[PDB]
Amino acid sequence: AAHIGLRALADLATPMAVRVAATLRVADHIAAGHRTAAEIASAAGAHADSLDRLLRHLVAVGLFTRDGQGVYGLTEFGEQLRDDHAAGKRKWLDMNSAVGRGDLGFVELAHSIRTGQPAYPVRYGTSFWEDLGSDPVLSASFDTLMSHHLELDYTGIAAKYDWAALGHVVDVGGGSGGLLSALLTAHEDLSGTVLDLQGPASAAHRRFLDTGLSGRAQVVVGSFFDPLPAGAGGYVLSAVLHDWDDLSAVAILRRCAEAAGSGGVVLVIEAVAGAGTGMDLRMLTYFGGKERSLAELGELAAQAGLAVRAAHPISYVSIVEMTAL
Amino acid sequence: GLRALADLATPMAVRVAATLRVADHIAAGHRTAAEIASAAGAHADSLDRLLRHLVAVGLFTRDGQGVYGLTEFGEQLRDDHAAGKRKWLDMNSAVGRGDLGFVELAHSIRTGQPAYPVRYGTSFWEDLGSDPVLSASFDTLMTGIAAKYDWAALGHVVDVGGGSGGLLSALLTAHEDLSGTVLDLQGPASAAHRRFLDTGLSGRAQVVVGSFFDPLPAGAGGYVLSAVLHDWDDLSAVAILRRCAEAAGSGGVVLVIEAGTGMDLRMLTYFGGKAELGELAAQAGLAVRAAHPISYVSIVEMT
Ligand SMILES: Nc1ncnc2c1ncn2[C@@H]1O[C@H](CSCC[C@H](N)C(=O)O)[C@@H](O)[C@H]1O
Ligand SMILES: Nc1ncnc2c1ncn2[C@@H]1O[C@H](CSCC[C@H](N)C(=O)O)[C@@H](O)[C@H]1O
């Protein structure tokens, strides 16, 4: 990766140009017939002269084509910007999407490096969760993005662990219930509850009504820093811990160990340090969170009165099993 | 990849490192996360996470002891390095600072206005004009034109927005009997002072600190402005031209002299700027009378 050049590696022009085009849905406009800078500008609500400059830059990058008459077109590479593209990439870049909005926080990375605190608040004046809690567009956006994450690393998850033996599973920070949905469908005698904030919890309850699972699945609006529904055989922490600093992480794990007691299990499911540095920084900038190794996970577990008993690889992520220490 | 082309993590990681001058500290002897963070005044745990990302990028080396080192490429982060890249990335540096303005690029695309103000609340030229350091960083980080026009006939020429010594120094050097004055903001003008001073042009070269938007120093046989046109919107320009006119009065000629798609977007981000144009200047101001193309850059004379 050293074969690029210091400056080029630090370039912000191209990444932002791509993000602006994704946001302005430029690719969809030209595919719809709006081909000139003027046509695309009036269609996307932009300034023709300025938009043209951004298009020229993106042509140089190879996403678009421009003939001698100023008529633009999509290259096979540019087709990826279309909102209907099968790879679903435009969504991650749109500044209106949860992650598209959040990645701009990297502009304030110096603050996180100097303080260890999240950069997202320095840019938007509030926490990521608070923002999603106030805006259903952002919340729904983040949920959709997570569903995409579930597909990639969770397919066949029901077969990678003995979920049936749990009897009842509590998904702590379970989102809209996509994971619990997959588990209950495969294991018909299993029951479970989604514990999350109003937003996701409501979406999950809506999901259960829709797929006819409300009978075995329920929802609990609550904070995982507070006492959790006790008595369950297992508590799942799916892509949650990396969102928090050590202090908060142990707080969450501690509430899980509490609820699980001597008889239950706590399952942390996420990419152990074994994504990498890139996601780690994203976690730091967004929430002051972090990617951890199985060892760091063990250190956190001990502090909550828990112990790692096993770690099951399932894809890009792993399932780490913990029980009363 | 597309999501890769849009990555912001690595570019900012690079810029934060340059700003904290991690490479310099390392070369100085601080090779541990805690030691670098101590020298750079950062949070050790967080700094270590940034360095690990840069190790994977190929700028830094890290041994199983926790000691960090610089790779061939990492050497370029040295504020001492010959290529002088550090200046382009240091958030304290002219372009290292304005570049973060790219995060507001959407504003420029939707309106045509500079993004920089949306981030910093002040304009780019305002800040540079207020800090001779910041100013000098942008200039260093950036001839025959005289042998192409009859400057000598002007007698005295006011380089409007003449930045630092620049063109006037070359004009006065090509015409040993011409005199000139650089009109610009405090920042650039200071530099213009040191230059003309060392270049022994004290006798025929002078500097006046002021805005080219209010009454200008009249008299001069000609008022020249290069690389000052695009930095502004039409109005701004004609607004500036009006000043030259009121100081030229067709007794003098107002001259207007004028590669990188990424550089083009930087200009849009920084200034929201960019012959019928100079004519649009002729319309609401001094009338065009010629144009003389030199290489890439032309010279549109008025009066
Ligand atoms: N204090 C809190 N209490 C409960 N849930 C919270 C919370 N703060 C954040 N969350 C939830 O933690 C989740 C992290 S991201 C989604 C995780 C989900 N298990 C999945 O795999 O998709 C989000 O749903 C967020 O709403
Ligand atoms: N309001 C203002 N009044 C005077 N000079 C200004 C100004 N705003 C910007 N400038 C100057 O305009 C110049 C733009 S950079 C181009 C400089 C030009 N090529 C030259 O002859 O040196 C900078 O020096 C900037 O400081």
From Swiss-Prot, chain B:
It comes from the Bacteria. Gene3D superfamilies: 1.10.287.1350, Vaccinia Virus protein VP39 (3.40.50.150), Winged helix-like DNA-binding domain superfamily/Winged helix DNA-binding domain (1.10.10.10). Substrate binds at residues 3, 231. S-adenosyl-L-methionine binds at residues 125, 159-163, 184, 211-212, 226-227. Pathway: Antibiotic biosynthesis. Optimum pH is 6.0. Transmembrane segments: none annotated. GO terms for biological process: antibiotic biosynthetic process; methylation. It catalyses: 2,7-dihydroxy-5-methyl-1-naphthoate + S-adenosyl-L-methionine = 2-hydroxy-7-methoxy-5-methyl-1-naphthoate + S-adenosyl-L-homocysteine + H(+). One of its GO terms (molecular function) is O-methyltransferase activity. Keywords: Antibiotic biosynthesis, Methyltransferase, S-adenosyl-L-methionine, Transferase. S-adenosyl-L-methionine-dependent O-methyltransferase that catalyzes regiospecific methylation at the 7-hydroxy group of 2,7-dihydroxy-5-methyl-1-naphthoate in the biosynthesis of the naphthoate moiety of the neocarzinostatin chromophore. Also recognizes other dihydroxynaphthoate as substrates and catalyzes their regiospecific O-methylation. The carboxylate and its ortho-hydroxy groups of the substrate appear to be crucial for NcsB1 substrate recognition and binding, and O-methylation takes place only at the free hydroxy group of these dihydroxynaphthoic acids. This is 2,7-dihydroxy-5-methyl-1-naphthoate 7-O-methyltransferase. It comes from Streptomyces carzinostaticus. The lineage of its organism: Bacteria, Bacillati, Actinomycetota, Actinomycetes, Kitasatosporales. The gene is ncsB1.
